[PDB]
Symmetry: D2
Amino acid sequence: CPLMVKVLDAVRGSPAINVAVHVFRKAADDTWEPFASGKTSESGELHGLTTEEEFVEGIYKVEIDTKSYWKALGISPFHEHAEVVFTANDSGPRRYTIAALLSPYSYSTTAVVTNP
Amino acid sequence: CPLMVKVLDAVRGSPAINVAVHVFRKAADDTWEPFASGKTSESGELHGLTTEEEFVEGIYKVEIDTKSYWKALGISPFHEHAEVVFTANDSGPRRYTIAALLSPYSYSTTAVVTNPKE
Amino acid sequence: CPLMVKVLDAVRGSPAINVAVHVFRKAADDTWEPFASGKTSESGELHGLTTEEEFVEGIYKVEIDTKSYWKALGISPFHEHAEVVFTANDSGPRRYTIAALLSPYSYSTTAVVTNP
Amino acid sequence: CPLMVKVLDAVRGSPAINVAVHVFRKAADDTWEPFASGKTSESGELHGLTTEEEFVEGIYKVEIDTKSYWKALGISPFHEHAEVVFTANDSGPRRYTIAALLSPYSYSTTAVVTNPKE
Ligand SMILES: N[C@@H](Cc1cc(I)c(Oc2cc(I)c(O)c(I)c2)c(I)c1)C(=O)O
Ligand SMILES: N[C@@H](Cc1cc(I)c(Oc2cc(I)c(O)c(I)c2)c(I)c1)C(=O)O
Protein backbone atom coordinates (compact mmCIF):
# COMPACT_ATOMS: atom_id res chain seq x y z
CA CYS A 1 0.00 0.00 0.00
CA PRO A 2 1.26 3.59 0.68
CA LEU A 3 3.61 2.61 3.54
CA MET A 4 6.16 -0.16 3.33
CA VAL A 5 9.00 -1.22 5.63
CA LYS A 6 12.05 -3.26 4.70
CA VAL A 7 14.56 -4.71 7.16
CA LEU A 8 17.87 -6.36 6.44
CA ASP A 9 20.48 -8.18 8.50
CA ALA A 10 24.09 -6.96 7.86
CA VAL A 11 25.63 -9.82 9.86
CA ARG A 12 24.04 -12.75 8.00
CA GLY A 13 23.33 -10.81 4.81
CA SER A 14 19.66 -11.73 4.71
CA PRO A 15 16.30 -10.06 5.26
CA ALA A 16 15.45 -9.57 8.91
CA ILE A 17 12.32 -11.65 9.29
CA ASN A 18 9.68 -11.68 11.94
CA VAL A 19 10.64 -8.34 13.45
CA ALA A 20 8.00 -6.37 15.31
CA VAL A 21 7.26 -3.01 13.73
CA HIS A 22 4.97 -0.48 15.40
CA VAL A 23 3.76 2.70 13.76
CA PHE A 24 2.53 5.80 15.53
CA ARG A 25 0.86 9.02 14.58
CA LYS A 26 1.47 12.12 16.68
CA ALA A 27 -1.87 13.23 18.02
CA ALA A 28 -2.74 16.83 18.91
CA ASP A 29 -2.15 16.07 22.56
CA ASP A 30 1.32 15.54 21.07
CA THR A 31 1.59 12.00 22.34
CA TRP A 32 2.13 8.95 20.18
CA GLU A 33 -0.97 6.88 19.48
CA PRO A 34 -1.19 3.40 17.94
CA PHE A 35 -1.64 3.49 14.19
CA ALA A 36 -0.47 0.12 12.82
CA SER A 37 1.83 -2.81 13.62
CA GLY A 38 3.10 -6.08 12.18
CA LYS A 39 6.00 -8.48 12.01
CA THR A 40 8.26 -8.47 8.92
CA SER A 41 7.77 -11.39 6.48
CA GLU A 42 10.27 -13.89 5.05
CA SER A 43 11.70 -11.26 2.75
CA GLY A 44 12.05 -8.75 5.61
CA GLU A 45 9.09 -6.70 4.33
CA LEU A 46 5.91 -5.37 5.92
CA HIS A 47 3.11 -4.20 3.62
CA GLY A 48 -0.46 -2.97 3.66
CA LEU A 49 -0.07 -1.35 7.06
CA THR A 50 -2.51 1.36 6.06
CA THR A 51 -4.55 2.72 3.15
CA GLU A 52 -4.49 6.06 1.36
CA GLU A 53 -7.80 7.13 2.87
CA GLU A 54 -6.50 6.80 6.47
CA PHE A 55 -2.79 7.74 5.82
CA VAL A 56 -3.26 11.52 6.30
CA GLU A 57 -0.63 14.24 6.48
CA GLY A 58 1.05 14.46 9.86
CA ILE A 59 3.93 13.12 11.88
CA TYR A 60 4.50 9.37 12.00
CA LYS A 61 7.00 7.29 13.93
CA VAL A 62 8.08 3.82 12.94
CA GLU A 63 9.64 1.76 15.72
CA ILE A 64 11.51 -1.48 15.01
CA ASP A 65 12.23 -3.92 17.84
CA THR A 66 15.78 -4.65 16.90
CA LYS A 67 16.56 -5.86 20.43
CA SER A 68 14.22 -8.87 20.41
CA TYR A 69 15.52 -9.79 16.96
CA TRP A 70 19.21 -9.79 17.97
CA LYS A 71 18.61 -11.56 21.31
CA ALA A 72 16.97 -14.37 19.34
CA LEU A 73 20.18 -14.93 17.35
CA GLY A 74 21.92 -14.88 20.73
CA ILE A 75 23.78 -11.63 20.06
CA SER A 76 24.00 -8.74 22.49
CA PRO A 77 22.62 -5.56 20.86
CA PHE A 78 23.38 -1.93 21.69
CA HIS A 79 20.08 -0.25 20.83
CA GLU A 80 16.79 -0.79 22.61
CA HIS A 81 15.16 -0.41 19.22
CA ALA A 82 15.26 1.77 16.11
CA GLU A 83 12.92 4.68 15.44
CA VAL A 84 12.21 6.83 12.43
CA VAL A 85 10.24 10.04 12.74
CA PHE A 86 9.12 11.83 9.63
CA THR A 87 6.46 14.20 8.38
CA ALA A 88 4.27 12.67 5.68
CA ASN A 89 2.78 15.52 3.66
CA ASP A 90 1.73 13.74 0.49
CA SER A 91 1.63 16.82 -1.62
CA GLY A 92 3.29 15.05 -4.50
CA PRO A 93 4.64 11.49 -4.42
CA ARG A 94 2.56 8.79 -2.75
CA ARG A 95 4.66 5.81 -1.61
CA TYR A 96 7.08 5.69 1.29
CA THR A 97 9.51 2.90 1.93
CA ILE A 98 11.37 2.97 5.22
CA ALA A 99 14.43 0.75 4.87
CA ALA A 100 16.67 -0.15 7.81
CA LEU A 101 19.94 -2.06 7.76
CA LEU A 102 20.80 -3.66 11.16
CA SER A 103 24.05 -4.58 12.92
CA PRO A 104 24.27 -5.29 16.73
CA TYR A 105 25.99 -1.88 17.26
CA SER A 106 24.62 0.08 14.35
CA TYR A 107 21.70 0.60 12.06
CA SER A 108 21.18 2.76 9.02
CA THR A 109 17.80 3.84 7.71
CA THR A 110 16.83 5.36 4.38
CA ALA A 111 13.54 6.51 2.91
CA VAL A 112 12.50 6.00 -0.70
CA VAL A 113 9.61 8.28 -1.61
CA THR A 114 8.23 7.48 -5.09
CA ASN A 115 5.07 8.33 -7.06
CA PRO A 116 3.76 5.27 -9.01
CA CYS B 1 33.94 11.95 29.36
CA PRO B 2 31.58 8.99 29.54
CA LEU B 3 29.31 10.31 26.79
CA MET B 4 30.58 11.70 23.48
CA VAL B 5 28.72 12.41 20.22
CA LYS B 6 30.20 12.69 16.73
CA VAL B 7 28.18 13.84 13.72
CA LEU B 8 29.34 13.85 10.09
CA ASP B 9 27.80 15.33 6.95
CA ALA B 10 27.70 12.93 4.00
CA VAL B 11 26.69 15.55 1.40
CA ARG B 12 29.60 17.95 2.06
CA GLY B 13 32.33 15.64 3.33
CA SER B 14 32.60 17.48 6.58
CA PRO B 15 31.81 17.30 10.28
CA ALA B 16 28.30 18.53 11.17
CA ILE B 17 28.73 21.91 12.92
CA ASN B 18 26.13 23.43 15.33
CA VAL B 19 23.83 20.42 15.48
CA ALA B 20 21.72 20.49 18.67
CA VAL B 21 21.69 17.39 20.79
CA HIS B 22 19.34 16.58 23.66
CA VAL B 23 19.86 13.70 26.04
CA PHE B 24 17.11 12.17 28.15
CA ARG B 25 17.05 9.48 30.77
CA LYS B 26 13.99 7.23 31.26
CA ALA B 27 12.55 8.52 34.51
CA ALA B 28 11.25 6.31 37.32
CA ASP B 29 7.72 6.77 35.96
CA ASP B 30 8.60 5.79 32.39
CA THR B 31 8.78 9.42 31.55
CA TRP B 32 11.70 10.96 29.66
CA GLU B 33 13.75 13.32 31.74
CA PRO B 34 16.04 15.92 30.19
CA PHE B 35 19.53 14.87 31.19
CA ALA B 36 21.87 17.14 29.16
CA SER B 37 22.14 19.11 25.92
CA GLY B 38 24.73 20.71 23.66
CA LYS B 39 25.72 21.64 20.15
CA THR B 40 28.40 20.02 18.03
CA SER B 41 31.51 22.10 17.53
CA GLU B 42 33.67 22.93 14.54
CA SER B 43 34.81 19.26 14.50
CA GLY B 44 31.21 17.96 14.74
CA GLU B 45 31.83 16.70 18.29
CA LEU B 46 30.16 17.20 21.60
CA HIS B 47 31.91 16.39 24.88
CA GLY B 48 31.16 17.55 28.43
CA LEU B 49 27.53 16.41 28.61
CA THR B 50 28.02 14.58 31.88
CA THR B 51 30.40 13.06 34.42
CA GLU B 52 31.08 9.60 35.82
CA GLU B 53 29.06 10.27 39.00
CA GLU B 54 26.06 11.80 37.21
CA PHE B 55 25.89 9.05 34.53
CA VAL B 56 24.22 6.12 36.39
CA GLU B 57 22.54 2.93 35.09
CA GLY B 58 19.44 3.42 32.93
CA ILE B 59 18.01 3.81 29.44
CA TYR B 60 19.10 7.00 27.69
CA LYS B 61 17.97 8.75 24.55
CA VAL B 62 20.20 10.89 22.41
CA GLU B 63 18.19 13.07 20.08
CA ILE B 64 19.91 14.83 17.23
CA ASP B 65 17.99 17.61 15.46
CA THR B 66 19.02 16.73 11.94
CA LYS B 67 16.02 18.69 10.63
CA SER B 68 17.19 22.09 11.82
CA TYR B 69 20.65 21.31 10.45
CA TRP B 70 19.50 20.59 6.88
CA LYS B 71 16.89 23.37 6.78
CA ALA B 72 19.61 25.89 7.62
CA LEU B 73 21.39 24.54 4.54
CA GLY B 74 18.55 25.04 2.02
CA ILE B 75 17.57 21.35 1.95
CA SER B 76 14.31 20.04 3.40
CA PRO B 77 15.04 16.57 4.92
CA PHE B 78 12.94 13.47 5.36
CA HIS B 79 13.43 12.81 9.09
CA GLU B 80 12.38 15.10 11.97
CA HIS B 81 15.38 14.06 14.03
CA ALA B 82 17.67 11.14 14.75
CA GLU B 83 17.25 9.33 18.09
CA VAL B 84 19.40 6.62 19.63
CA VAL B 85 17.96 4.66 22.58
CA PHE B 86 20.20 2.43 24.69
CA THR B 87 20.83 1.02 28.13
CA ALA B 88 24.04 2.27 29.74
CA ASN B 89 26.45 1.20 32.50
CA ASP B 90 24.43 -1.88 33.57
CA SER B 91 27.70 -3.79 33.95
CA GLY B 92 29.63 -1.08 35.77
CA PRO B 93 30.49 2.12 33.80
CA ARG B 94 31.63 2.36 30.22
CA ARG B 95 32.50 5.06 27.72
CA TYR B 96 30.06 5.60 24.87
CA THR B 97 30.75 7.27 21.56
CA ILE B 98 27.53 7.85 19.62
CA ALA B 99 28.38 8.60 16.01
CA ALA B 100 25.95 9.58 13.22
CA LEU B 101 26.41 10.03 9.49
CA LEU B 102 23.77 12.34 7.96
CA SER B 103 22.18 12.57 4.53
CA PRO B 104 18.87 14.34 3.61
CA TYR B 105 16.88 11.08 3.31
CA SER B 106 19.09 8.78 5.29
CA TYR B 107 21.29 8.55 8.34
CA SER B 108 23.49 6.02 9.99
CA THR B 109 24.47 5.58 13.62
CA THR B 110 26.89 3.28 15.44
CA ALA B 111 28.15 3.21 19.03
CA VAL B 112 31.67 2.77 20.36
CA VAL B 113 31.82 1.36 23.83
CA THR B 114 35.15 1.12 25.61
CA ASN B 115 35.95 -0.10 29.11
CA PRO B 116 37.79 2.48 31.22
CA LYS B 117 38.62 -0.68 33.11
CA GLU B 118 35.69 -0.39 35.65
CA CYS C 1 18.01 -13.71 -12.52
CA PRO C 2 20.80 -14.83 -10.09
CA LEU C 3 22.47 -11.39 -9.86
CA MET C 4 20.63 -8.18 -9.11
CA VAL C 5 21.81 -4.66 -8.31
CA LYS C 6 19.88 -1.94 -6.53
CA VAL C 7 20.94 1.69 -6.23
CA LEU C 8 19.41 4.44 -4.15
CA ASP C 9 19.94 8.17 -3.80
CA ALA C 10 20.26 9.35 -0.14
CA VAL C 11 20.07 13.04 -1.09
CA ARG C 12 16.76 12.97 -3.00
CA GLY C 13 15.46 9.81 -1.35
CA SER C 14 14.75 8.04 -4.63
CA PRO C 15 16.16 5.18 -6.67
CA ALA C 16 19.31 6.10 -8.56
CA ILE C 17 18.25 5.61 -12.15
CA ASN C 18 20.26 5.26 -15.29
CA VAL C 19 23.53 4.51 -13.54
CA ALA C 20 26.17 2.54 -15.41
CA VAL C 21 27.01 -0.75 -13.75
CA HIS C 22 29.86 -2.95 -15.00
CA VAL C 23 30.53 -6.46 -13.77
CA PHE C 24 33.82 -8.30 -13.95
CA ARG C 25 35.05 -11.79 -13.34
CA LYS C 26 38.63 -12.32 -12.22
CA ALA C 27 40.31 -14.45 -14.84
CA ALA C 28 43.24 -16.79 -14.15
CA ASP C 29 45.63 -14.21 -15.50
CA ASP C 30 44.20 -12.44 -12.45
CA THR C 31 42.99 -9.46 -14.44
CA TRP C 32 39.41 -8.27 -14.62
CA GLU C 33 37.52 -9.25 -17.75
CA PRO C 34 34.14 -7.97 -18.97
CA PHE C 35 31.26 -10.10 -17.79
CA ALA C 36 28.11 -7.94 -17.93
CA SER C 37 26.95 -4.31 -17.86
CA GLY C 38 23.81 -2.19 -17.85
CA LYS C 39 22.24 1.02 -16.66
CA THR C 40 19.86 0.94 -13.66
CA SER C 41 16.13 1.28 -14.47
CA GLU C 42 13.50 3.69 -13.14
CA SER C 43 13.36 1.86 -9.85
CA GLY C 44 17.17 1.90 -9.52
CA GLU C 45 17.39 -1.83 -10.34
CA LEU C 46 19.41 -3.88 -12.82
CA HIS C 47 18.29 -7.45 -13.54
CA GLY C 48 19.02 -10.41 -15.76
CA LEU C 49 22.70 -9.55 -16.03
CA THR C 50 23.55 -13.22 -16.25
CA THR C 51 22.09 -16.72 -16.04
CA GLU C 52 22.77 -19.61 -13.68
CA GLU C 53 24.56 -21.61 -16.36
CA GLU C 54 27.20 -18.87 -16.93
CA PHE C 55 27.33 -17.46 -13.32
CA VAL C 56 30.06 -19.86 -12.07
CA GLU C 57 31.93 -19.82 -8.78
CA GLY C 58 34.75 -17.29 -8.71
CA ILE C 59 35.54 -13.71 -7.90
CA TYR C 60 33.31 -10.97 -9.30
CA LYS C 61 33.57 -7.21 -9.11
CA VAL C 62 30.66 -4.85 -9.53
CA GLU C 63 31.58 -1.28 -10.40
CA ILE C 64 29.04 1.54 -10.20
CA ASP C 65 29.75 4.86 -11.93
CA THR C 66 28.62 7.07 -9.13
CA LYS C 67 30.64 10.00 -10.50
CA SER C 68 28.72 10.40 -13.77
CA TYR C 69 25.47 10.13 -11.82
CA TRP C 70 26.32 12.90 -9.33
CA LYS C 71 27.82 15.23 -11.98
CA ALA C 72 24.50 15.01 -13.82
CA LEU C 73 22.65 16.39 -10.79
CA GLY C 74 25.36 19.06 -10.75
CA ILE C 75 26.89 17.89 -7.47
CA SER C 76 30.60 17.40 -6.88
CA PRO C 77 31.28 13.79 -5.79
CA PHE C 78 34.20 12.42 -3.79
CA HIS C 79 34.51 8.90 -5.22
CA GLU C 80 35.52 8.04 -8.77
CA HIS C 81 33.06 5.17 -8.51
CA ALA C 82 32.00 2.40 -6.15
CA GLU C 83 33.23 -1.18 -6.32
CA VAL C 84 32.20 -4.40 -4.65
CA VAL C 85 34.41 -7.46 -4.78
CA PHE C 86 33.07 -10.76 -3.56
CA THR C 87 33.52 -14.47 -4.01
CA ALA C 88 30.42 -16.19 -5.38
CA ASN C 89 30.59 -19.85 -4.38
CA ASP C 90 26.98 -20.91 -4.79
CA SER C 91 27.24 -23.89 -2.55
CA GLY C 92 23.92 -23.14 -0.95
CA PRO C 93 21.79 -20.05 -1.63
CA ARG C 94 21.37 -18.88 -5.22
CA ARG C 95 20.45 -15.19 -5.45
CA TYR C 96 22.69 -12.21 -4.77
CA THR C 97 21.50 -8.67 -4.46
CA ILE C 98 24.14 -5.98 -4.28
CA ALA C 99 22.55 -2.86 -2.81
CA ALA C 100 24.33 0.50 -2.66
CA LEU C 101 23.16 3.69 -1.00
CA LEU C 102 24.84 6.84 -2.45
CA SER C 103 25.70 10.27 -1.04
CA PRO C 104 28.25 12.68 -2.72
CA TYR C 105 30.81 11.89 0.04
CA SER C 106 29.72 8.43 1.06
CA TYR C 107 28.21 5.20 -0.06
CA SER C 108 27.16 2.08 1.77
CA THR C 109 26.75 -1.33 0.17
CA THR C 110 25.08 -4.46 1.47
CA ALA C 111 24.58 -7.92 0.03
CA VAL C 112 21.42 -9.98 0.41
CA VAL C 113 22.07 -13.63 -0.40
CA THR C 114 18.84 -15.66 -0.47
CA ASN C 115 17.77 -19.09 -1.75
CA PRO C 116 14.31 -18.95 -3.47
CA CYS D 1 49.03 14.06 8.05
CA PRO D 2 47.28 14.51 4.73
CA LEU D 3 45.92 10.96 4.67
CA MET D 4 44.21 9.31 7.65
CA VAL D 5 42.07 6.15 7.84
CA LYS D 6 39.54 5.23 10.52
CA VAL D 7 37.86 1.82 10.69
CA LEU D 8 35.05 0.80 13.04
CA ASP D 9 33.48 -2.58 13.80
CA ALA D 10 29.68 -2.57 13.75
CA VAL D 11 29.26 -6.06 15.25
CA ARG D 12 31.32 -5.42 18.41
CA GLY D 13 30.93 -1.68 18.93
CA SER D 14 34.62 -1.10 18.73
CA PRO D 15 37.39 0.29 16.55
CA ALA D 16 38.78 -2.23 14.04
CA ILE D 17 42.27 -3.22 15.29
CA ASN D 18 45.06 -4.63 13.03
CA VAL D 19 43.26 -4.12 9.72
CA ALA D 20 45.76 -3.95 6.84
CA VAL D 21 45.49 -1.03 4.48
CA HIS D 22 47.20 -0.62 1.12
CA VAL D 23 47.27 2.62 -0.80
CA PHE D 24 47.92 2.87 -4.53
CA ARG D 25 48.30 5.75 -6.91
CA LYS D 26 47.22 5.47 -10.57
CA ALA D 27 50.54 5.34 -12.37
CA ALA D 28 51.35 7.24 -15.57
CA ASP D 29 50.51 4.10 -17.57
CA ASP D 30 47.11 3.55 -15.93
CA THR D 31 48.72 1.02 -13.72
CA TRP D 32 48.25 0.98 -9.94
CA GLU D 33 51.38 1.78 -8.03
CA PRO D 34 51.83 0.86 -4.38
CA PHE D 35 52.02 4.16 -2.55
CA ALA D 36 51.88 3.24 1.17
CA SER D 37 50.58 0.63 3.62
CA GLY D 38 49.85 0.17 7.31
CA LYS D 39 47.70 -1.46 9.93
CA THR D 40 45.08 0.19 12.10
CA SER D 41 46.04 0.60 15.73
CA GLU D 42 44.26 0.01 19.00
CA SER D 43 41.97 2.96 18.15
CA GLY D 44 41.28 1.65 14.62
CA GLU D 45 43.29 4.51 13.09
CA LEU D 46 46.16 4.74 10.70
CA HIS D 47 48.25 7.90 10.37
CA GLY D 48 51.74 8.42 8.93
CA LEU D 49 51.10 6.95 5.48
CA THR D 50 52.54 9.95 3.68
CA THR D 51 53.62 13.59 3.80
CA GLU D 52 52.57 16.83 2.12
CA GLU D 53 55.44 16.67 -0.41
CA GLU D 54 54.93 13.00 -1.31
CA PHE D 55 51.13 13.32 -1.69
CA VAL D 56 50.72 14.98 -5.14
CA GLU D 57 47.70 15.29 -7.46
CA GLY D 58 46.25 12.03 -8.80
CA ILE D 59 43.74 9.22 -8.33
CA TYR D 60 44.37 7.08 -5.26
CA LYS D 61 42.99 3.80 -4.05
CA VAL D 62 42.68 2.84 -0.44
CA GLU D 63 42.18 -0.87 -0.04
CA ILE D 64 41.08 -2.26 3.29
CA ASP D 65 41.39 -6.02 3.82
CA THR D 66 38.11 -6.53 5.61
CA LYS D 67 38.25 -10.22 4.72
CA SER D 68 41.32 -11.04 6.79
CA TYR D 69 39.82 -9.06 9.66
CA TRP D 70 36.56 -11.04 9.85
CA LYS D 71 38.16 -14.43 9.17
CA ALA D 72 40.44 -13.90 12.17
CA LEU D 73 37.22 -13.43 14.15
CA GLY D 74 35.51 -16.71 13.17
CA ILE D 75 33.14 -15.06 10.67
CA SER D 76 33.40 -15.60 6.91
CA PRO D 77 32.44 -12.26 5.22
CA PHE D 78 30.82 -11.43 1.91
CA HIS D 79 33.34 -8.94 0.49
CA GLU D 80 37.00 -9.63 -0.38
CA HIS D 81 38.02 -6.14 0.65
CA ALA D 82 36.80 -2.56 0.76
CA GLU D 83 38.28 -0.10 -1.76
CA VAL D 84 37.84 3.66 -2.00
CA VAL D 85 38.90 5.38 -5.24
CA PHE D 86 39.21 9.16 -5.39
CA THR D 87 41.03 12.08 -6.94
CA ALA D 88 43.13 14.08 -4.47
CA ASN D 89 44.66 17.56 -4.20
CA ASP D 90 43.55 18.72 -7.68
CA SER D 91 42.71 22.12 -6.19
CA GLY D 92 45.86 22.52 -4.10
CA PRO D 93 46.32 20.13 -1.12
CA ARG D 94 43.69 18.98 1.32
CA ARG D 95 43.43 16.64 4.29
CA TYR D 96 41.49 13.43 3.77
CA THR D 97 39.96 11.24 6.43
CA ILE D 98 38.74 7.95 4.96
CA ALA D 99 36.40 6.28 7.42
CA ALA D 100 34.78 2.83 7.10
CA LEU D 101 32.15 1.05 9.16
CA LEU D 102 32.34 -2.75 8.82
CA SER D 103 29.77 -5.53 9.04
CA PRO D 104 30.10 -9.12 7.66
CA TYR D 105 27.80 -8.48 4.67
CA SER D 106 27.96 -4.74 4.51
CA TYR D 107 30.24 -1.77 4.90
CA SER D 108 29.99 1.96 4.76
CA THR D 109 32.58 4.58 3.87
CA THR D 110 32.61 8.38 3.94
CA ALA D 111 35.40 10.92 3.46
CA VAL D 112 36.23 14.03 5.47
CA VAL D 113 38.07 16.66 3.53
CA THR D 114 39.37 19.73 5.31
CA ASN D 115 41.37 22.65 3.97
CA PRO D 116 44.66 23.21 5.80
CA LYS D 117 44.19 26.59 4.18
CA GLU D 118 46.30 25.80 1.02
N1 LIG E 1 37.95 12.41 17.54
C1 LIG E 1 37.61 11.91 16.18
C2 LIG E 1 36.15 11.97 16.01
C3 LIG E 1 35.70 10.84 15.20
C4 LIG E 1 35.17 9.66 15.75
C5 LIG E 1 34.77 8.64 14.90
I1 LIG E 1 33.98 6.92 15.78
C6 LIG E 1 34.84 8.70 13.52
O1 LIG E 1 34.48 7.66 12.68
C7 LIG E 1 33.29 7.62 11.97
C8 LIG E 1 33.22 6.63 10.96
C9 LIG E 1 32.02 6.51 10.22
I2 LIG E 1 31.76 5.09 8.67
C10 LIG E 1 30.91 7.34 10.44
O2 LIG E 1 29.77 7.28 9.76
C11 LIG E 1 31.09 8.29 11.45
I3 LIG E 1 29.59 9.64 11.98
C12 LIG E 1 32.25 8.43 12.20
C13 LIG E 1 35.37 9.88 13.02
I4 LIG E 1 35.63 10.30 11.01
C14 LIG E 1 35.78 10.92 13.85
C15 LIG E 1 38.43 12.90 15.30
O3 LIG E 1 37.95 13.98 14.97
O4 LIG E 1 39.56 12.46 14.99
N1 LIG F 1 10.11 -4.94 -2.25
C1 LIG F 1 10.94 -3.72 -2.00
C2 LIG F 1 12.06 -4.16 -1.08
C3 LIG F 1 13.40 -3.44 -1.04
C4 LIG F 1 13.55 -2.07 -0.75
C5 LIG F 1 14.82 -1.55 -0.75
I1 LIG F 1 15.10 0.47 -0.31
C6 LIG F 1 15.95 -2.29 -0.99
O1 LIG F 1 17.18 -1.68 -0.99
C7 LIG F 1 18.08 -1.50 0.05
C8 LIG F 1 19.39 -1.03 -0.18
C9 LIG F 1 20.23 -0.88 0.94
I2 LIG F 1 22.18 -0.20 0.64
C10 LIG F 1 19.84 -1.17 2.26
O2 LIG F 1 20.65 -1.03 3.30
C11 LIG F 1 18.52 -1.64 2.36
I3 LIG F 1 17.74 -2.13 4.25
C12 LIG F 1 17.65 -1.80 1.28
C13 LIG F 1 15.79 -3.64 -1.28
I4 LIG F 1 17.39 -4.90 -1.69
C14 LIG F 1 14.51 -4.19 -1.30
C15 LIG F 1 11.46 -3.21 -3.39
O3 LIG F 1 12.26 -3.92 -4.00
O4 LIG F 1 11.03 -2.11 -3.77
